[PDB]
Design a protein around this ligand. Sequence first.
Ligand SMILES: NC(=O)CC[C@H](NC[C@@H](O)[C@@H](O)[C@H](O)[C@H](O)CO)C(=O)O
Ligand SMILES: [Ca+2]
Ligand SMILES: [Ca+2]
Length: 325
Amino acid sequence: MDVVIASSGGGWQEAQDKALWAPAAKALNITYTQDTFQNWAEARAQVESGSVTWDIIQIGIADEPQAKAAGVLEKLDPDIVNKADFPPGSVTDSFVANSNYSTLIAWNKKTYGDNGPKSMADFFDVKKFPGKRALWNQPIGMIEAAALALGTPRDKVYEFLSTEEGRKAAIAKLTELAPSVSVWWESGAQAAQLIKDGEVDMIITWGGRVQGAINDGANFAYTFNDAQLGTDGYAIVKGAPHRDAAMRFLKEMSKAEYQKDLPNSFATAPANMKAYDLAKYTPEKMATMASAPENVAVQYSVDPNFWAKHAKWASEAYDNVRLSR
Ligand SMILES: NC(=O)CC[C@H](NC[C@@H](O)[C@@H](O)[C@H](O)[C@H](O)CO)C(=O)O
Ligand SMILES: [Ca+2]
Ligand SMILES: [Ca+2]
């Protein structure tokens, strides 16, 4: 009888549960069960099997087009949110944004001190910065990182990846780096643990996971330079067993009154513009936020239109880079 909600575990899932799920479910007087997953294809497997157990799934904005095309997502009720309260394009007919985050470069201060990599060109430069690299085992942010390393200006990432030539060169760049990649991390918590144990010299991972590891004593530093500004959000699984209750739950948790608490401990940025007026975050708090003006200036936004067209190519080609060893 519980609504089943799933995200990717660790500090991020804990932040959503504390700020959004527990207070929203209390207000609606409903019960819910949590689950965890890393790949949107796991939601597809539930749909393909004919046994859907998940109701709400937290996915990345760039997985939304391929999930919707594969018939994995329920169409949401018309006025689930007022689109004017959220960033443009962050709310689709099948997805409601809950946050902005960054896929960024972090480095081990024991290895490099303050003179760590401060750009993707630096991250890919094994001669100037020798050491163990860690990259995600999924391609969003990883293909673009290679395009940036090749010298592509931040505002031209997706123009470069719009051609076959550019897409192949980006994979060739990742192939070149692959022998220096000690671990292809799978979850944010695993990435945070690699950082806390100093098991890697540099890593491309999510800002909240990095800041959480540093708060826990990791001797790492990071930059927003060349980071990808992402958007996470919620969708309802096609054939969700508690579809109607899940719709009410998603509408409630998207409210400004809950969104304001999302970054209380975890370094994330709420997507609901009204949450900023309620919480009145200090400039120190804003500095860790992916969407703060000073951080946006050195980032580029993920392009869901690119991922709508090339996700299948990207998944297979990147699988081969990591399988090359
Ligand atoms: N929004 C945030 O502050 C969290 C950022 C980050 N979330 C990564 C997600 O895009 C990712 O796990 C996707 O949900 C997943 O691949 C399926 O779409 C994290 O798990 O630390
Ligand atoms: Ca994502
Ligand atoms: Ca974590």
